[PDB]
Amino acid sequence: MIEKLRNIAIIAHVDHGKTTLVDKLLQQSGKERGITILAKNTADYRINIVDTPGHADFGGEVERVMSMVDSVLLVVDAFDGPMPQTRFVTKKAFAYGLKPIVVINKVDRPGARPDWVVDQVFDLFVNLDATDEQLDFPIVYASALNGLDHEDMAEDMTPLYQAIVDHVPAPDVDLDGPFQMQISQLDYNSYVGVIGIGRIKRGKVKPNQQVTIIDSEGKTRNAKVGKVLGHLGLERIETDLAEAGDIVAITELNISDTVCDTQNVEALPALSVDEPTVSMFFCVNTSPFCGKEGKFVTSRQILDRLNKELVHNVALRVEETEDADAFRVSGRGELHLSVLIENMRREGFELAVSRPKVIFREIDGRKQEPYENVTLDVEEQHQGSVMQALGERKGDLKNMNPDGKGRVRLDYVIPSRGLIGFRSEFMTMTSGTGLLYSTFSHYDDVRPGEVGQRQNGVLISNGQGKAVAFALFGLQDRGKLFLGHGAEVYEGQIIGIHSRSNDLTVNCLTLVPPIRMTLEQALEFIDDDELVEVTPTSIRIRKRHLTENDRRRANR
Numbered sequence: 001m002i003e004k005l006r007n008i009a010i011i012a013h014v015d016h017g018k019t020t021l022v023d024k025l026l027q028q029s030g031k032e033r034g035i036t037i038l039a040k041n042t043a044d045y046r047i048n049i050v051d052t053p054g055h056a057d058f059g060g061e062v063e064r065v066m067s068m069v070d071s072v073l074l075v076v077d078a079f080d081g082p083m084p085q086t087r088f089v090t091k092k093a094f095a096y097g098l099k100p101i102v103v104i105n106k107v108d109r110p111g112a113r114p115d116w117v118v119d120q121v122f123d124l125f126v127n128l129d130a131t132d133e134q135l136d137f138p139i140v141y142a143s144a145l146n147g148l149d150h151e152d153m154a155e156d157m158t159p160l161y162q163a164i165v166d167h168v169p170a171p172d173v174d175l176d177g178p179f180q181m182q183i184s185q186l187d188y189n190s191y192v193g194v195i196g197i198g199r200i201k202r203g204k205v206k207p208n209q210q211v212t213i214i215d216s217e218g219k220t221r222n223a224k225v226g227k228v229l230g231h232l233g234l235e236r237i238e239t240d241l242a243e244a245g246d247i248v249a250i251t252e253l254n255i256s257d258t259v260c261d262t263q264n265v266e267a268l269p270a271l272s273v274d275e276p277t278v279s280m281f282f283c284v285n286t287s288p289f290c291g292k293e294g295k296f297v298t299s300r301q302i303l304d305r306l307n308k309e310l311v312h313n314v315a316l317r318v319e320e321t322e323d324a325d326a327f328r329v330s331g332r333g334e335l336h337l338s339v340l341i342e343n344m345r346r347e348g349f350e351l352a353v354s355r356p357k358v359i360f361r362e363i364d365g366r367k368q369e370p371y372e373n374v375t376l377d378v379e380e381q382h383q384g385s386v387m388q389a390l391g392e393r394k395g396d397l398k399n400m401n402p403d404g405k406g407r408v409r410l411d412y413v414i415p416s417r418g419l420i421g422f423r424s425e426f427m428t429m430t431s432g433t434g435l436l437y438s439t440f441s442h443y444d445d446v447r448p449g450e451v452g453q454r455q456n457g458v459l460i461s462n463g464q465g466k467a468v469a470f471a472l473f474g475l476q477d478r479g480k481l482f483l484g485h486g487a488e489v490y491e492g493q494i495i496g497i498h499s500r501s502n503d504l505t506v507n508c509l510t511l512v513p514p515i516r517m518t519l520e521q522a523l524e525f526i527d528d529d530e531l532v533e534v535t536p537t538s539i540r541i542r543k544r545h546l547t548e549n550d551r552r553r554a555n556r
């Protein structure tokens, strides 16, 4: 049963499908796909074959695919050869010691050239070390509708069979002991819940069987389970090990998230660089515009929506709270999350989100909060205020190579927790002639001393009427304003900033041009108490508490 298992993956050249071969090899029972096509054969070898995508999504997609398999397959046109659509995977394929299997496809073509293509699939195949292969054999020559070189050439359908059982081994994993499995792939359905798919590392799995989740500590229960056969994932009572076993009704559930039994077990590692860096709660809009401007409010629409992204987004991680109408969403970047928000924003979603709290994950002893490699380019007299603010952000400098044309380029290493806010007043210090983006680098020990705050606070309001020049031109002698003449806010909606740490509960009812604050500039601003309402039309900045005594209430 288990020593006849062979877990492989295929790489689609330009030409998509490979069936041909993917297909016809359903030849003993048993456009397009794809996962996982587990043929069945003896002259019984179950062979789960996971199709690595022709594309590359993002944030560590394909490396996660070969976390299941122990070897690979490479389809290459005999007319043409291998391409950049193959150079994407194969590189990451050899990263784990995966012995390849080369397939010269299309052999029957009149413009085909076998041993030249082989000679290309050597030279553009070794440059990336290995270092074996060598063999690398494999080295089959295969038609679709199915006399040169290997063999050749009987029922060019069984030769490939040899290759798999001969050179691909069975997954070295323990049948017995307490159950363990790491989720490799992920998908969702409009009334399943989340769905697993993976590779059984330890033990065996009963369909109605309690379990635990890992990286955190949830003890969610199991309900249903399913095997794969043909292009279908077909239900099964119970499955052992080493298979592409597909599973439901657990939770949330995530990519990389490990999960084993409940007795004597836990856990599973292997990130590797998929784990997120940032997080913020996603809440259904409870503020005074509940279904006004927008068209998706009921929590299980949002939930539904977030899950659907967790198929595409491999660099995303969504977990569910004690509170029903709220979800801690986390991703490998603040910019990677704002995508999800503003994309959802203009699908017509009314929801709100909490402040970007950093993922203070841990690597050996020190609680290593993440850092990033900043690059910023500014006019010279701005530099004084630029440098100044960053040495207060616990942002270490690396190099500042001056171009000598009236500008300077500055290059820092800054902590994530202290990058929150700066791209507002970088654009205010430089007055627009400051241009900066950046990139995530790695986590580092404590800053230390949490100093990623902002302050002062802002001006909170106390009525649902419209803002008037009779109140705003006076209230703006406390500080700058987020609204102008005429707009109906509510009790809670921060309509501006004070000049000092004071929060105020003012009246706009009884002018300077205001501040056009973006989605990003709202999130990367709010305090831990406050929240950002995001309708599909405008953007509001509420507090979570709406009045001047309701504020004083929660303060114990």
Ligand SMILES: Nc1nc2c(ncn2[C@@H]2O[C@H](COP(=O)(O)OP(=O)(O)O)[C@@H](O)[C@H]2O)c(=O)[nH]1
Binding pocket: 015, 016, 017, 018, 019, 020, 021, 022, 031, 032, 105, 106, 107, 108, 109, 142, 143, 144, 145
């Ligand atoms: N002559 C020849 N043509 C092939 C062979 N394999 C595929 N093709 C052609 O190339 C195209 C790509 O193969 P296909 O089976 O469509 O792969 P799919 O994208 O997985 O369906 C098909 O339209 C076939 O007509 C082969 O072994 N010999």
